[PDB]
């Protein structure tokens, strides 16, 4: 049963979320890495709006954002996926398909799981509330490396879990599998994070440079 406090919290989260494309290969890469920077900036802005987040130590904020950023970017990307054209649209105007990503020099091993995830997420047909809560739940993962106040992180995570459960019970009143199905996507996101670290590793083999913000959160 969705409480007034939960309703108000979810609505607030939803409300909080409301180089040119043409070496030539590396102009595409610069365009994409620049869009990724925009996503990371938005992730940080949203995190700061999450109840409980700014009360964690700044070090715990950084610990959580360092490793959740790729997962939240993947969630945000899934949300922008167009099943009919099999494309993903960034900043409302920039639409891209698998070939576009390959042309930027990204590996097939990276591209294909992200498209497969995006397609599986699309079948779920999550709305803005469900995406917002799942992003919150991904951010408040107590098992991230270097988290100090694991108890508080876990406590926070559970309040978002409980809100998602109650919300989904109104959105999907005859399908009790929707709630766990959503949660189970967080499992796929963990595997995808390791696919991502493999792409980051390959970029440095190729002497392909991540811009400073991206390098800071992802380079070893």
């Amino acid at each position: 049963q969705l409480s007034p406090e939960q309703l108000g919290m979810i609505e607030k989260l939803v409300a909080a979320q409301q180089t040119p494309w043409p070496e030539a290969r590396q102009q595409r890469f610069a365009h994409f890495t620049e869009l990724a920077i925009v996503s990371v900036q938005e992730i940080v802005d949203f995190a700061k709006q999450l109840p409980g987040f700014l009360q964690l130590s700044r070090e715990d904020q950084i610990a959580l954002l360092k490793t959740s950023a790729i997962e939240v970017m993947l969630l945000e990307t899934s949300r922008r996926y167009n099943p009919g054209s099999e494309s993903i649209t960034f900043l409302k105007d920039f639409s891209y398909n698998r070939e576009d990503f390959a042309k930027a020099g990204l590996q097939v091993e990276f591209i294909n799981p992200i498209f497969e995830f995006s397609r599986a997420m699309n079948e779920l047909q999550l709305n803005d509330a469900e995406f917002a809560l799942l992003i919150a739940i991904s951010i408040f993962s107590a098992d991230r490396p270097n988290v100090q106040d694991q108890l508080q992180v876990e406590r926070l995570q559970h309040t978002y879990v409980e809100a998602l459960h109650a919300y989904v019970s109104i959105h999907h009143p005859h399908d009790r599998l929707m709630f766990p199905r959503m949660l189970m996507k967080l499992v796929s996101l963990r595997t995808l994070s390791s696919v991502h670290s493999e792409q980051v590793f390959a970029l440095r083999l190729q002497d392909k440079k991540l811009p400073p913000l991206l390098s800071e959160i992802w380079d070893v």
């Binding site: 700044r58 070090e59 950084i62 610990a63 954002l65 360092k66 400073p212 913000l213 959160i217």
Partner: peptide, 15 residues
């Protein structure tokens, strides 16, 4: 610390 090694993220958080 993580903080000292993540200047840009730290600045974004401080804003």
């Amino acid at each position: 610390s993580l903080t000292e090694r993540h200047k840009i993220l730290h600045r974004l958080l401080q804003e």
